[PDB]
């Protein structure tokens, strides 16, 4: 079956700056600003646009050795990012792939909110473990706050 899971998180960074750093250069930043979560980001194919395949390696004492993502869509105008988890990590057994959508929306105070949508493709009637859904939420926020701290400490960056 297909199971959807959504999340919203708040950031002080405005939408235009956050999209450039967190989405367009998240692959560059994540090994640098969050070494405890991402050890290395490795492009397999493409630039980073649609059709791009990337191998994300996790540091030692890892829940998963690696994971492979496919970039599905990058909408600069609407601050919308689509990618799919297709190999490694939780992929296998009863879980076929994970379809993800991230949309950054400007907020009335000058900040932004991230609308994360996680779409899991499971085996027949099987269901996903709540820890799997929880772990993805943990990973996203830690990366966001690490990039958020980087931008605040580097006011010239992405601006």
């Amino acid at each position: 079956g297909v199971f959807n899971y959504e999340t919203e998180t708040t950031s002080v960074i405005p939408a235009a700056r956050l999209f450039k750093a967190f989405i367009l250069d998240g692959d560059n930043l994540f090994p640098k600003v969050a070494p405890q979560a991402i050890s290395s980001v490795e492009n397999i194919e493409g630039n980073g646009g649609p059709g791009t395949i990337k191998k994300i390696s996790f540091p030692e004492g890892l829940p998963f050795k690696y994971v492979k993502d496919r970039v599905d869509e990058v909408d600069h105008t609407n601050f919308k990012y689509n990618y799919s988890v297709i190999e490694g990590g939780p992929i296998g057994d009863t879980l076929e792939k994970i379809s993800n959508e991230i949309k950054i929306v400007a907020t009335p105070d000058g900040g932004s909110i991230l609308k994360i949508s996680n779409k899991y493709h499971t085996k027949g009637d099987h269901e996903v473990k709540a820890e799997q859904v929880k772990a993805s939420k943990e990973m996203g926020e830690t990366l966001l706050r690490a990039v958020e701290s980087y931008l605040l400490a580097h006011s010239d960056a992405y601006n």
Epitope: E45, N47, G49, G51
Partner: antibody, heavy 120, light 109 residues
Framework: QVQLVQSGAEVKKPGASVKVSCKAS????????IFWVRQATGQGLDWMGW????????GYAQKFQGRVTVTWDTSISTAYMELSSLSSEDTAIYYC?????????????WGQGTLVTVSS | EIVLTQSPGTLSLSPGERATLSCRAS???????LAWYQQKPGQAPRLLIY???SRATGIPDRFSGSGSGTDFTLTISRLEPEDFAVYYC?????????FGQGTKVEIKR
Amino acid sequence: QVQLVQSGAEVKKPGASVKVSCKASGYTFISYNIFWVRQATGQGLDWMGWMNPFRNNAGYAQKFQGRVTVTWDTSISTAYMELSSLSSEDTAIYYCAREHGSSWGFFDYWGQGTLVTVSS
Amino acid sequence: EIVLTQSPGTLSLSPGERATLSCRASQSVSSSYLAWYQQKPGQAPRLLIYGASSRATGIPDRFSGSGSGTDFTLTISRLEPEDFAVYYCQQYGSSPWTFGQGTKVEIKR
């Protein structure tokens, strides 16, 4: 099927500039990088510079020393390379090659070659 | 740069024989990031073994690659008349990316 079709033979006087085109087809143009590689029979292969149509930036080989300029037209999926200040040492065949990935930089598909002859 | 030295400059062999081509790197090439290309006179290079051991699509099984660190090899288990050409090795483990000078596989009589 991915193809890289280049413009044809150029004959130039020394001191002039040559602009070679490389039209890509069979894939999304902005999704892959394209390098330019010279092949003169003197040496083997030398990369000249690379374009990144998704990040809108470029990098250049040191040996050619800023005589290489890479531009592109996404609307027609065509990559351009202009080699300014042409001498008789620049007589060679120039190739355009698609980079497979920004980290897996192996050129899966290659252009057919463009001959540039710069003699007086 | 990582300078790639290929040996021998010319390899002379008969059809059906094993061909072993060497690509020595001045520095260690990370993750076995080295590729092999085939080029015939008047033609563009064609991708072959990549990742130092992985075949490109359309490449027959007689082409195989091996090695790690500073030494990589390209093996043609059984040469055929279509296999006599110049082969190049290309590393992409460290920027900037460099090629070898070329090893020519020659017919022999």
